[PDB]
Subunit: 231 residues, 6 copies
């Protein structure tokens, strides 16, 4: 239920032994990326989806419809991390990506068990989630390894950020209060990936990283915007 | 998204031209079946699922989780009518089953489109819905044609009966009021199939028909009961 | 306040020493009778009276108006049990009926004390409650002793059944929640009378018993239906 | 069911032709009486009964229990006017009291019809309502005619005064809003009887009038206070 | 926060050592004054201001607007007590008034600190509060010392009286429930001043005292009536 | 009481004739400033103050307490524009600042009239609002004219931006819905001042402008944060 893709302490082995989950430093690429897309994050808060979460009035059909699509996304995201692991020549990143794929596998049992979804091929994605997933797959299979940390960061940081923002706007007895509880708290998975990414920032083009991060943030916005248009 | 599987007037052609959807007569097999399972129907009203619908407090995860499983069930149900048509004892029933399969195809667009489900094989059914679908497939492929009308009747009459019962218990401004609107009103699909069944009443063993209808009703109860157990 | 007409353990004396209040067996006349009237019970749940109880919106004038009439009914019901005791030649039934009259006397203090009602003759019954009470009196004074157990069973079983059904539909903080509390729980009085009746089932015509039980159930429905028509 | 005991225009004939229902003059005995008991009226507003009316949370058993007792009170009140007419000091007052008895008869249809009460003798009054009715019967049968106008005034003015005070405190959609609608508006019955009283003001001892009015007001308070004690 | 102007035990020194805060006797000038203005108090309860307090719907702009004006009033009231102390030749009243001015100073820190108000001259009073304050100042500076106890009594007794009246009408979870809590309880300050005043009742004209008290009560009503007319 | 400080068309005369209030271009200094402080704006949304506005539960004492301080701030702000006009580097800016002072005078009627505040000197500002006003006075009197446009922009854009964000989070029937209505819509005053600023962009140091705008934004945050601490 708790939505996290962090690598747990028990799997911080080998080259990952010293990987930390503390908040990245102010001058990190992680905060540079986030700060640059903050206008998009605010637009996410302005969607009918999140206004419905806070009010308790989100159409249960919109909620469920998006959950199925998020299953599709997460099934593919796990495969993207497996691809990134296969394609990495850097041993630390191979181990990191392999462990991230395992974290996705663990989280994804909610889709298999609670939501009765077998695999991505048994779903028909909407255009926006399909485009988003295809973009991530492109990054995983075609770009340098550290860009995978960039493109996957929005989905790991944005959701807790939204949850922590909406906490004080979502009454504890309201119907979608569970969304806050499942997603909110310290975004340790995001921070952990931010701390991994910082160690490779010299190996990538930061203007490219900005573009990739912004593009993924724009897809998050598209997905949430379209989620409540059931027409 | 009106939940109906009725054969529309435009498709009542050939052998089906004179098939009516008026309420079956009091002495029909249709009412004999329904009246004998009324204790089960009352227990469906006592499930946490329907108490949640009426109060507007059903967990959206329960609602969605069950909807995915109903997609599985309806995808299979369509295939069962295709099987029954292939096995049909006469041309009238072949046409009836083909028309029912098409009505399922039309309704099933909601599962493909709104719920993003491709096909039954891409879902992992829970035990109760799997057992139910397997039972319907057994009837379609192994028993005489008229028993298909019997086994498929509960899902066509029960849901409207529940909606119509709960209408006065479910406030018009409540979150799951849509359930009443989409399922309630005159159960013309059920009446239509009861009227078809009545024409083959002399062709079947009424005690076996009761057993089959009661089994399907019991599965509806089991499915609705298990729907809110997300453990 | 707790609405029960059971004979308490302290008055299970003499021939009644061994009378049990456990649930009657599945093959009992008690369940045969109930199962046969279940459609009527469902119609009772569809009345504006019970929809108002569950919603907390029942007009307090309708509530009170029916309570006065129920005082009339219960005053007469006590007298009917006294009649049945007088008219019984079977010693066990004489003792049973005498004890039931005493249970009615005890319950009826709520009408004398809380509702300020002196006796039936000081009230003007509505047509439906008058007809119902006259029917019970006819059974008591004109038919064989065991039919008195039949005709009085609906009022003892239906109300707890309704309360137990509506429990999960009636919020604990709503205005008529007390109705659930006063009437719900194990229907021990009904079961006890069912266990008495079973011992005489060989002495009556079961088709007649069905008719009597169904008629009383139909009166319950009439009374509840008319309760909210204050025009 | 507008609660009024006013003599309608159609019955203002003979000696009553010119009787007005305009607000009594500031210097009238009517206002002298009312103003002197205003502390009691304020205490009626502080009862649990009226706090329940305003909040919509008055126990329906308290509402109904008191209504039965008000039936007792009004059945007797009608008889008191009949007595006062028999004892009347002059023809004008005979006609006034007869007209008031008929207004009670008209209003009392609500007790016979909606509340199913036959007559006072079929009710068991609580202590406070019994004491109050006995006091009114004492005035009607033992004191000079004009004092009847004095003792019966509280029940005609207080209830509208309470309704009009609570109007702005009782939401239009609340369960006991009907109380405001049925009792509020212009207290024309009270004004009418005040205007009759004023014509006999020189015939009575104003200190005795104050004692009598204050006693009746104190009984209204005691009745409303005890109404919610269902112990 | 607790709105009291009582002199605390620690400042009951000198001539004030024996001053009590128990309820004044029934025959006191205090109750004579209050009883005579009770109709005005009831009109205060009928204002849109208090209907808004009880309902939780009072416009926060009306609430705040009046609070600023009450700061003005209380700033001036403190000065009035200082004037009364200066102008008193009776040593007990000098000490009393001096201590009352100190109680006002203590209460008035809420206006300085929470409401950011420096002094009366920095505010622009509405007509009604200005007239009220000017009347009090006239009494303080131009009439015999004991009349100061008379004119200041309404503001000390009326507010707790209103709070204690509205307690049972103001839900504990409603937005202005704090008003009840801050103002309600035993009106010890009012009683204390009533007990002081009783010792000088022989030294003033009680018809004049009535006029002064009634005039101040009428100003309270004017102030509350105008508070919600922001046009 | 629409909160706007825009110069109305009737006062766009002389040098101001062609001043527009259209949205500034994407490359303007206006948007550069705003975009750089967006993290602060998001933190304003996270204050207890705005969570209270959206929920309708903001303590009316917090609302009013802050309103008094905003009066202080606006009284001073008007004086700051008067100072800036006296110090103006050219005639166009002299006219602009004079027009802005008049717009403040017009708006400030709400503080004089509804809130009964005479002038800044009659208020005791809290620390944060004092610091903020002192900073604006420093800019007006000590720095080059165009920086006045920079420091005063946050209070003109932030409030509408907040209102427009919270519109979909604040129910139309909620107690502080008026806040959305009075502050929201098109921020034409802010756009107008941004368009004036843009004409002097070559006259200022953009890094200093960012520092100044960021300081004012940080003060808005501090003020809103401290507003609900009534300790």
């Amino acid at each position: 239920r708790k939505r996290t893709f962090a690598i747990p302490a028990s799997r911080l082995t080998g080259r990952l032994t010293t990987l930390k989950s503390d908040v990245p430093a102010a001058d990190s690429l992680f905060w540079k990326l986030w700060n640059g897309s903050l206008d998009t994050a605010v637009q996410v808060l302005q969607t009918d989806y999140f206004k419905g979460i806070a009010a308790g009035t989100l159409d249960p059909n919109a909620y469920g419809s998006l959950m199925v699509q998020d299953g599709y996304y997460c099934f593919r995201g796990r495969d993207d991390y497996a691809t990134a692991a296969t394609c990495a020549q850097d041993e630390t990143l191979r181990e990191f990506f392999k462990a991230k794929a395992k974290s996705y596998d663990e989280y994804n049992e909610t889709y298999h068990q609670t939501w009765h979804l077998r695999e991505a091929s048994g779903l028909i994605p909407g255009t926006d989630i399909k485009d988003y997933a295809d973009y991530e797959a492109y990054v995983a299979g075609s770009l340098a390894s550290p860009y995978m940390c960039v493109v996957m960061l929005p989905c790991e940081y944005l959701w807790p950020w939204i949850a922590n923002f909406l906490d004080g706007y979502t009454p504890t007895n309201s119907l979608y209060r569970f969304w806050i509880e499942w997603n909110g708290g310290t975004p340790n998975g995001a921070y952990q990936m931010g701390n991994m990414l910082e160690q490779y920032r010299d190996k990538i083009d930061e203007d490219k990283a900005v573009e990739i991060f912004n593009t993924a943030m724009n897809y998050e916005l598209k997905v949430f915007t379209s989620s409540t248009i059931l027409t």
